[PDB]
Design a protein around this nucleic acid. Structure first.
Lengths: 103, 63, 146, 194
RNA sequence: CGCGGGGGGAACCUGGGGAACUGAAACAUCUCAGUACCCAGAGGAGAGGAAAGAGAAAUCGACUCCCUGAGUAGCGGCGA
RNA sequence: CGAAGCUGUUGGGAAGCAGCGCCAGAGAGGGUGAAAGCCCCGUAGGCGAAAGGUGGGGGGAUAGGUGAGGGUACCCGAGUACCCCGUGGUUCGUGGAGCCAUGGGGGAAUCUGGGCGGACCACCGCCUAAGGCUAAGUACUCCGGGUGACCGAUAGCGCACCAGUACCGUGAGGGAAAGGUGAAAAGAACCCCGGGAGGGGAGUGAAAUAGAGCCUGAAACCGUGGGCUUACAAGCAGUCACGGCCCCGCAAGGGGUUGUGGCGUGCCUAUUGAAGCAUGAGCCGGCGACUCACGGUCGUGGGCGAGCUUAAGCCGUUGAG
RNA sequence: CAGGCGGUAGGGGAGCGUUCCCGAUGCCGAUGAAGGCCGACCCGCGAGGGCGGCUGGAGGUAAGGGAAGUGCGAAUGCCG
């Protein structure tokens, strides 16, 4: 394969692949595609330790990898990110847009 | 593969049209009998009554 | 068209074979008291004989088996009429042989049996038969000489 | 075949008198089809196969079981027989049939609804949709299948994804797939081949 | 001083050395085989290579690879 | 860079469906919580490659190569050819065997000369040895690729798991076994058995006949425990028979087992000749053996049919041609 | 309807069971492909084919015919 998926927090956007509702980003790696952003409620019961809040049983989490989300752009729907010829920044850029030059 | 037919056999025999296995025989090879008397003469050709079949084959490429 | 169960056109049969089995006549060979099945089983090209296969003979036809070459002579080609009395326009080889059928023939010879239109056709050598069929009743030419 | 300017086209003279040789037709055709398909696999063992430890165990006694040749074509890794052979065998035929076949076939496939403007427009000849726009303005729709010969890159670099349909251009001939189809169109009788 | 070069590299080169089993329903010519296989330089190629040619045709016109010729000519205890 | 709808009701969960809206020179393929074009990765395509460096065509191309004839008139690859013997190659094993290198001695000649058209003389023909260099179109594979009616992890590659290891060797040598929880370890919390080990609950958990020689899990080998059998008794043992003896069908019966009576010499390989202590048979599973190339040659549906059939290429073939 | 019918090798007739092909941008398919344990119905003389139940956990390939490393009790066989 290869290292090509998404980006950083900002807002990202939670969805319903069996979960529902939408929220902001958090963190994300590409190797296996795994990452996080609160919401996804999952608890990993710890072992016979204690150092931490105490012995065994874990807590809150998150969990996913592949596709299955979106981005912010209120009212109407959302689009992509075009280019630059003689406008604002030289001939580069792009920070998630509605369909004009914002988000 | 190939099967390069055998010259010798073909050095003598022939299938007279009819597919008949016919050719020369063996005998009057310059007497090899002696006796001034008489006989030798007798000679000719002849088919084969059971082998002939076989033969013709190893000569289906050369003809 | 379609794939309207296009089986076949009557008779064929891929009649394959197979290893061993216990059905019908499967499993056997046919022989015994006749040893001959080997890793390089005979072959089997005629083989056997057990009597020089009547090869007690000998060759007499002496005219070949020499070595480098054979007998070198320009082609020897005769003929017959009942083959193309059809067209003529001008009966000359190449136009024929070189066409329809028939192969090279340096020197030309002619005959056959049937009849035809006695018309001049290449003749690097012909037969009396044609003479009459192309004399006071036909047309014949001449040979090479070059 | 058009209905704009040109209007009218009929044929079958070819040889209506006979037309009854289906047997051999389909048959052999089927044959070469198999050929093309690449069939490359190997066979192994013969004498050696693997440069074995070369000869080994005893005899007389031995592990009770007989043996000498370390070729042990008895396990799932030893010699066996020649099942495949990259020699997918190169058999074939001519054009003296590359013809007659489809002849009788389409004739009856004309009783189906052949036709073939021999050259028709559609529009941008490069925009898929619009091409079909002449599919409807003609009378076709994904169901009874068909094909066609368009000797021009034009509609080629256009027809793109031709499901249920043809989208040819060059010349190779694909009767078979027409079997699973029906109607069709041509690029000049000449394009087919004199 | 200069390089070269020993040394290196799966097949494919060139060369120099060069078997036996097996066939021949024994066996000694012949066979496998100039194969297996050793040693020999180099290249990705290599080897080869330009007529003291072919051959019979008032002829063709460097050398290599394929097309057949031709399994023909022939080799041969003319035996395999 | 790229192309284009969802939706609720049920459904673990929805790639389920209707009502229908959609880009589509681009519906290849890998795929993300149940059989997904409009969804992560692509696929028509056409952008462009460098700084690094960097393999070279085309272009130009540089020093380094390119008239005709006429008579004078001497001059050119030697221990060389041609003899010779032993020769090898040549299809050429002596044979009427030339020419190639000849190992051995002989042993010249240089164009009004010199080699071959397979013996010694006579006519005629193309070439000019004994300097060496020479591309192109040729072979090839560990991998890169692709694909591959290529195998698909007791395969295949020895080998997808840290093997050319354990290991056996002395060298050489030789060679193993050993892939698979799951959408996510989320991999076990806690408390009573407690030697750590190995237990029960609970929880996560769509799923613990889901938890670490855990995928699904048969077969030889295991009895808990159930049901039908048995201590006068003789047998390849199984069968067929009335009978009785426990599940199931209202019924008809269907069953399971067996009493006795009857009945019973097996099985796989060899041969005048078998069941046979003539062989083999651990046991169950599991692997196992004439294609196919090419080549020869009788039939079969066929077409052409005195006529009936083109290799090796060249354009082209996603493909095909 | 007469007839035929045991029958080793051999030699015919098919049929059957057994893995890729297109059909496969066609069709079942989680109210299940696939394994299976069971089946004491139906179809197959057989080959088998079914045909439906419970365990079973991710795919299958129609009619058709087109290709075949199989139609394996065993060889003191290979192995586990």
């Amino acid at each position: 394969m290869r290292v090509k998926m998404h980006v950083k927090k900002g807002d990202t956007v939670l969805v319903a692949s069996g979960k529902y509702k939408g929220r902001v980003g958090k963190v994300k790696e590409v190797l296996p595609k795994k990452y996080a952003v609160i919401v996804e409620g999952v608890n990993i019961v710890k072992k016979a330790v204690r150092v931490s809040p105490k012995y065994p049983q874990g807590g809150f989490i998150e969990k996913e990898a592949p596709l299955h989300a979106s981005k912010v752009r209120p009212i109407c729907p959302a689009c992509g990110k075009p280019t630059r010829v003689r406008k604002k920044f030289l001939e580069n850029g792009k920070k998630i847009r509605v369909c004009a030059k914002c988000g | 593969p190939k099967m390069k037919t055998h010259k010798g056999a073909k050095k003598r025999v022939k299938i007279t049209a009819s597919g008949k296995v016919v050719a020369m025989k063996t005998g009057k090879r310059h007497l090899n009998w002696q006796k001034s008397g008489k006989e030798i003469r007798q000679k000719g050709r002849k088919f084969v009554l059971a082998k002939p079949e076989a033969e013709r084959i190893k000569l289906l490429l050369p003809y | 068209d379609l794939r309207p169960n296009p089986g076949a056109n009557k008779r064929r049969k891929r009649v394959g074979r197979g290893p061993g089995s216990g059905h019908g006549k499967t499993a056997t060979r046919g022989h015994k008291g006749q040893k001959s099945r080997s890793g390089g089983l005979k072959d089997p090209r005629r083989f056997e004989g057990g009597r020089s296969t009547t090869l007690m003979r000998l060759p007499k036809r002496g005219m070949q088996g020499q070595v480098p070459g054979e007998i070198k002579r320009p082609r020897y080609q005769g003929v017959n009429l009942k083959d193309l009395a059809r067209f003529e326009g001008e009966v000359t080889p190449e136009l024929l042989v070189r066409a329809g059928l028939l192969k090279k023939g340096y020197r030309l010879k002619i005959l056959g049996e049937g009849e035809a239109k006695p018309l001049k056709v290449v003749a690097h050598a012909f037969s009396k038969s044609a003479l009459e069929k192309l004399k006071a009743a036909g047309g014949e030419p001449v040979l090479l000489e070059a | 075949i058009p209905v704009l300017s040109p209007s009218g086209r009929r044929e079958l003279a070819a040889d209506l008198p006979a037309e009854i040789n289906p047997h051999l037709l389909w048959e052999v055709v089927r044959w070469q089809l198999a050929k093309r398909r690449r069939g490359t696999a190997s066979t192994k063992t013969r004498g050696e196969v693997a440069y074995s430890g070369r000869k080994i165990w005893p005899q007389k006694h031995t592990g009770r079981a007989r043996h000498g040749d370390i070729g042990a074509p008895i396990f799932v890794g030893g010699g066996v027989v020649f099942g495949p052979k990259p020699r997918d065998y190169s058999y074939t035929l001519p054009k003296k049939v590359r013809k007659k076949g489809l002849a009788m076939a389409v004739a009856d496939r004309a009783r189906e609804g052949k036709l073939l403007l021999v050259e028709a427009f559609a529009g941008v000849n490069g925009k898929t949709k619009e091409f079909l726009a002449w599919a409807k303005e003609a009378g076709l729709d994904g169901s009874e299948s068909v094909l066609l010969v368009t000797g021009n890159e034009l509609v080629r670099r256009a027809a793109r994804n031709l499901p249920w349909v043809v989208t040819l251009a060059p010349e190779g001939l694909n009767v078979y797939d027409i079997v699973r189809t029906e109607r069709l169109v041509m690029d000049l009788d000449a394009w087919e081949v004199f």
